[PDB]
Structures are given as structure tokens and as C-alpha cells.
Amino acid sequence: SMSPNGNLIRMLVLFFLESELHEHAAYLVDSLWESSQELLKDWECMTELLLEEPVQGEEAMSDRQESALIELMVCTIRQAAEAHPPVGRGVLTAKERKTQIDDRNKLTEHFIITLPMLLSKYSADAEKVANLLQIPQYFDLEIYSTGRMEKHLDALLKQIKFVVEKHVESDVLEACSKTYSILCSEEYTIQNRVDIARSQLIDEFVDRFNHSVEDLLDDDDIYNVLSTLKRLTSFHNAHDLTKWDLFGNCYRLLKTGIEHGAMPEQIVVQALQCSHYSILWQLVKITDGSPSKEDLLVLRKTVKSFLAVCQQCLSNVNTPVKEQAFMLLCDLLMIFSHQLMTGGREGLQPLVFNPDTGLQSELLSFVMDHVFIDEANKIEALHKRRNLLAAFSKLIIYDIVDMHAAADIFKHYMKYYNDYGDIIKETLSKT
Amino acid sequence: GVEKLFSLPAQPLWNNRLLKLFTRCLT
């Protein structure tokens, strides 16, 4: 529309696509940032290409070319606000410091209005949305009230709620949960308005989750419980959903998936994951406040119950359930260790859980079947296994599990050609 | 590399208040 650079930018997307440095998007923007800074900040032009018609006589953009523009656009937003190169290409002067302020004002004021339009046009695209939700972090959230633009905040929260209810992708839900935490930044002005919008979204899914579990106690009844719970889990990670009673139906989903084994693997992974955040959130309130002794006991009982469920899930037939239950055990045993009392927090003696040798054996036994065994998926699985070994290596270094059996076993498996060599050499040294 | 593995939990915690629980047990 207005901006002439529509031809320049439409071909920068092309120069980035047809040169196949697909993982150098943030690198490409930083490269041409010293010379082509003014072109890359024309976000008015970029939004016009995505939102406006290409006018008769011109050819429209392809689905992929529109995804590349968004990816390049968000990198320009990052480089402008942060005023430093991205991760991979690691002070400001006076003029540079002033330009950073104006750039934050320009990008905020532009995208306060246009971001809900972008989200609305491309709501059914998981890849694009996950990139579009990376923008609010760089906003100056005072302008929502300085400019009296609260009318557009509701449009954004309305579109965020629209993205959540029609998407189950793990990456999309991650972006939504992080955005709602940024809009609740507790800074000053908009803290109140976002909370009402947040509680509305949680309430509408706590009901659609609790009432969906009562129907599961069918192929369609399964998808109802999974979709409604996966969303709650991503939000429970970043937001204190303790006021809601989410542990209740999460435990019941596990206590009957263990007794009967009729539960599907993915529902168990989310139910286990959701309950982990609930316990961690309950611990933050107990830690920050001046609690009573009853509070420690009810949390002591809740933590003990979940740890038992995680041990039983180690014997599940499905590998993802086995994998998920292992990582939660390593994290909880580290959080609820003797280090938990360190820092003058002696009033947490009951909450300390030390693993018995029966459980320490099961953890070491899990490393034997899923870490030490005999192109996009083998590099995918290599990081999957390295994370599991590092989680157990943490327990060894901090004297949470007995080290004498694990140390000798690691020395016998060092025949894995640096696959775990750097991890193993570090854990062996710290003894 | 391994420094990032031994400094962060196995399950990533998005909220900084939750992540403090795992980091306070380090150093």
C-alpha cells in the first residue's frame, strides 16, 4: 500500500529462501543491519504485504514466502529493540541509545494495532502464529495506557484466546503461555485488565477438562481429555493455577491408568507433566510466605503421592511415559533435596525427600535401557538421550544417589564415541 | 554444551520463580 519498498522486501524474502541458509534468518538480518537498517525497520511495509491485497496485475505470495517474511520480520523487531546481534554473533553510544527508544516506540505503536490483524488472518497456521506471538515481549507496555489504546489490548487477548482453543501443537501453546505472562508483567497499568482475560480463559477450559474426564470413565472421548489438558499444562507451567483444583483430576487420570493400563501414552505424559507444575507452584507459596505446619504436611503428602506414581510409571509399557516419569523424578529429587533447606530455610525439614536405595536402583536401571543402547531422527534422539543422562548425573554429583555403582558403570560404557563422553567425563571428575 | 545441561533442569521451567527452585540447589 503506502510504502514503496514493497518490491525491495518481497525480494529480500526471496534472497533468503533461495539461498537455503534457513537457520541463518537472525544472522542475515544482523549482517545487513549496519547498511540496510532503514529498510529492515519498515514494519509498515511488512504488515502491508501480509495483510493487504497485492492488487490486480501482480502475483500473490506463496504460503512459504509469507512464513519467511514473518520470520524475518520478528528478527528485525528483535534487533531493533534489543540493539545487539542475536545468539551466534556475539556497549551502545549516545545516538544509538536514543534510536533504540524511538524504535521501541515505533514498533510498539505499529504492532499494538496490527498484531491482532496478523494473528486473525493466519490463525490456522501453527508455524506462523508461534512466530507472531514472539513480538509482545519487545513492547513498551505503558503505551497500552499512555495512548489510551486499551481498545486494541482486548483485540489481542481475544485473538490469543482464539489461537489456543483451535490449536494443540506444543510449540503454539508454549508461545501463548509465555505471552500471557508478559502481559501480566505486574509493571503497572494493564496488570488488572489482563487478569480478567486470563481467568476467563482458564475457567472455560477447567470446565471443559473436568467434565470431559467424567465421559472417559471411546476414540472421541479420548481426544476431548487430551486437548483440554494439554492446554492447561502449558499454561500451568508459567501461571500459578493453584487456585483451581487441577491436581484432583490429574491424579485420578493416573491412579486409573496405572491400575488398569488402559490409559493412552500421551494423556499420561500430560497428566504427569501438569501435576509436576502444580506441586512446584504449591511449593512457591509455601516457600515465600510464613506458612503453618499443616501446610507442610499437606504438601508433604501430595509430593509423596506423586513420587510413588512416577515410580510406578517407570514400569509402563510405553516408552514416552517411562521417559517422562524419569525426568520429573530427577528434577523433584534435586528440588526436594538437602539443598532445599540451605539458605536459612530450616522450616522445611519435612518436605525433604531422600530417595531410598530401591528407587536409586530403578533410576540407574532406566539409564541402562534407554541411554546405553546399540538422519533427522537420529540427531533428534541423540539430544533426547543426552538430556536423560545429564539429569541422572546431577543426582550423582550432589550426593542424592549413591555414586559407587553409577561411577563404575559409566566407566564401563565410555565406548560410545563422545556421544556421552563430555557428559561422562564431567560427572566422573566431580568425585 | 554440558554447562547448559548441568545448570538447567530436565523439564524446562518457563516461569523464573519456578526455575529458581532448581538453581538455588546449584552453585
Numbering used by the authors:
A (entry chain B): 457 to 546, 551 to 677, 684 to 840, 855 to 911
B (entry chain D): 368 to 394
Per the authors:
The complex consists of a tripartite ring comprising SMC1, SMC3, and RAD21 (also called SCC1 or Mcd1), which associates with a conserved peripheral fourth subunit that, in human somatic cells, is represented by two paralogs of the Scc3/STAG protein family, STAG1 or STAG2. STAG1/2 HEAT repeat proteins bind to the RAD21 subunit of the core cohesin ring and are required for the dynamic association of the complex with chromatin. The STAG1 protein is composed of HEAT repeats, a tandem repeat structural motif composed of two α helices linked by a short loop. STAG1 and STAG2, therefore, function redundantly in somatic mammalian cells to mediate sister chromatid cohesion, an event essential for cell viability during proliferation.
The STAG1 central region consists of HEAT repeats R6-R14 (residues 459–915), and the structure has been determined both alone and in complex with a 40–amino acid residue RAD21 peptide (spanning residues 356–395) to 2.3 and 3.1 Å, respectively (site VI). The RAD21 peptide adopts a compact conformation, forming two sections of an α-helix linked by an extended loop, and interacts with STAG1 within a U-shaped cleft around HEAT repeats R9-R14. The site IV interaction interface is extensive (>1,200 Å2 in area, with 12 hydrogen bonds and 1 salt bridge) and, in contrast to the situation in sites I and II, consists of a mixture of polar and nonpolar interfaces. The two helical regions of the peptide contribute to mostly hydrophobic interactions with buried side chains, whereas the extended loop forms extensive hydrogen-bonded interactions mostly of the form STAG1 side chain to RAD21 main chain. Overall, most of the contacts in site IV are conserved between STAG1 and STAG2. The first 12 residues of the RAD21 peptide, which form a further short section of α-helix in the STAG2 structure are disordered in the electron density and have not been included in the model. At this site, the side chains of STAG1 D797 form hydrogen bonds with the backbone amide residues A377 and Q378 in RAD21. These residues have previously been implicated in interaction with residue D793 in STAG2. Importantly, the STAG1 mutations D797K and D797A in site IV strongly reduced the binding to SMC1, SMC3, and RAD21. In contrast, the D797A-mutant STAG1 variant showed relatively small responses over the concentration range tested (7–1,000 nM) that appear to be the result of bulk responses, demonstrating the importance of STAG1’s D797 residue in binding RAD21.
